[PDB]
Design a protein around this ligand. Structure first.
Ligand SMILES: CCCCCCCCCCCCO[C@@H]1O[C@H](CO)[C@@H](O[C@H]2O[C@H](CO)[C@@H](O)[C@H](O)[C@H]2O)[C@H](O)[C@H]1O
Ligand SMILES: CCCCCCCCCCCCO[C@@H]1O[C@H](CO)[C@@H](O[C@H]2O[C@H](CO)[C@@H](O)[C@H](O)[C@H]2O)[C@H](O)[C@H]1O
Ligand SMILES: CCCCCCCCCCCCO[C@@H]1O[C@H](CO)[C@@H](O[C@H]2O[C@H](CO)[C@@H](O)[C@H](O)[C@H]2O)[C@H](O)[C@H]1O
Ligand code: NA
Ligand code: NA
Lengths: 34, 253, 250, 34
């Protein structure tokens, strides 16, 4: 296994399509700067 | 109380001794027997060997060599918007979203403490209260190395002893503090997006954790918290990593 | 050496919970029998107890945490004297050599590791003084204040339940830094003071007078409580030789 | 079990008679202010 990321308040927005059980692939968008 | 044979095994099974036994076997050069176990694994978990640099299962001398296999670069293009942070790991989102003050979601309806995940480090928790979290689950079929979401200067690493519970829907729903009680490595970075933590959490069998700057952190398991620090990026002795670069991995043992 | 290997093989936590279950049972004649066998084998001095009558204890744990008659533990009256918090024997004592505390001849452990990586708390005690007291099965199992103290911080630290004896003190690395323990930090007239209660196999249950039973349960995470400075609402103050906590089975 | 006491540098002197395996009793002298 498990990787946990933490980001500071106000700093990133998670890509809106991602939810529990969304497939992840290295290099694909996770979050965007605010 | 949930009366569940499978759940009770999590508490009865000698998870540490099974993890050490698996690490012993996975480190052995066992020729045809290595290849057999890898082939059974590849078949049962539906591993995609076409993404691997070495697609031939005979090319791996040890099961652990196979478990940590590299991918062909072409197959994981790194997003080029510098405003975009990318997924550090192949697998599936477990949970993600807002850190609700000190609370992170483990499963629908089940919270745990940011401060507990960070081994009681309230100064580090102060960086992330009301922030954002992403939990990625890597399954046996997935690539087991972990890459950077963005450019980062490494500032702090914390090794946290703990349990080796399995991670699945059953334990996510029924084992309190699952990720805050399992053996893990906390990595804290300075980034363009402010402080960022990338935490590698072990599980039964898959209990060995490495980083690219420190090598194998575990095993062995000395039972104590260990803390490393590095200076700010402008200073001699700093460690810097780029977006999509390898930062660590998991293996058996 | 066989005995050392058992430390790593034995289901220490399940044996501790089994003993806790038994020790919490109001089992009449069987409670009294186990108490009497224990008193015989460990040569317990029941004359020092408030209730010397072994039938007066409804549970083995009630017996294990038995109070003493006040007369038999006179508290030193020099206000410049700190007193022993526990009946037993000195394990090791002396100077904290930068971050290093002596476990046994030729084995050190880290002050920061004992304090579960709390570097700000370690900074209070670098180059300070430590005392390690071992309580045996025959000893009184409550722990008392070495001096007047305002409680400021308590930290519950999950960990192992290794046995504590000469063999493990000599051979188990980080014995006290890896065992389940409760760290208590006080303001005193002599500066910051820590009193740390470290569990062992069987004797794994830790209480304080302000919080009750800290363990069990064993929820696997560090927990931290804070209290304000003295003479503030919510403040917790204890006098020299007052009871501050105890050990029991479970 | 075990009780560990920590004191800040230069604040107390341990009574000089105490060593490894000295018997302890609650209320007996452990240390003195400097
Ligand atoms: C999930 C984990 C499961 C992974 C699958 C494999 C686990 C099975 C464990 C069985 C033990 C096999 O043990 C393995 O035997 C072969 C014999 O060919 C040895 O082979 C190697 O060392 C021996 C000497 O030690 C040399 O003579 C030999 O030329 C060399 O290649 C390995 O060094 C040994 O590690
Ligand atoms: C019977 C086995 O007993 C064996 O003895 C050694 C003592 O060196 C154990 O223990 C040793 O390694 C472990 C593993 O990291 C450490 O946590 C421990 O501090 C160290 O003393 C082994 O884990 C056990 O395999
Ligand atoms: C059937 C045998 C095992 O049964 C199982 O025991 C464990 C051991 O405490 C319990 O576990 C429970 O208490 C322990 C100890 O305080 C906690 O760390 C754990 O988070 C909690 O769920 C399970 O709730 C129960 O299902
Ligand atoms: Na192998
Ligand atoms: Na180990």
């Amino acid at each position: 296994x498990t990787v946990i990321n933490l980001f500071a308040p106000g700093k990133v927005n998670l890509v809106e399509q991602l939810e529990s059980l969304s497939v992840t692939k290295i290099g694909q968008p996770l979050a965007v700067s605010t | 109380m949930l009366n569940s044979f499978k759940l009770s095994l999590q508490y009865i099974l000698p998870k540490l001794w099974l993890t050490r036994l698996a690490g012993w076997g996975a480190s052995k050069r066992a020729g045809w027997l290595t290849k057999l176990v890898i082939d059974l694994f590849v078949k049962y978990y539906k591993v995609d060997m076409k993404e691997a640099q070495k697609p031939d299962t005979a090319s791996y001398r040890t099961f652990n060599e196979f478990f940590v296999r590299p991918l062909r670069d072409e197959v994981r293009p790194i997003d080029t918007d510098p405003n975009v942070l990318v997924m550090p790991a192949d697998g599936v989102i477990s949970q993600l979203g807002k850190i609700e003050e000190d609370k992170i979601l483990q499963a629908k309806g089940h919270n745990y403490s940011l401060e507990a995940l960070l081994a009681g480090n309230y100064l580090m928790a102060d960086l992330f209260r009301n922030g954002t979290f992403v939990t990625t689950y890597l399954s046996p079929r997935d690539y087991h190395r972990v890459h950077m979401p963005c450019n980062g200067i490494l500032r702090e690493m914390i090794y946290v002893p703990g349990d080796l519970f399995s991670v699945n829907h059953l334990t996510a729903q029924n084992v309190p503090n699952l990720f805050a009680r399992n053996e893990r490595v906390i990595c804290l970075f300075d980034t363009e997006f402010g402080p960022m933590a990338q935490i590698l959490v072990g599980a039964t069998i898959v209990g060995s954790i490495e980083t690219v700057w420190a090598g194998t952190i575990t095993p062995p398991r000395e039972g104590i918290i260990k803390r490393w620090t590095w200076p700010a990026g402008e200073n001699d002795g700093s460690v810097a990593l780029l977006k999509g670069q390898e930062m660590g991995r998991f293996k058996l043992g």
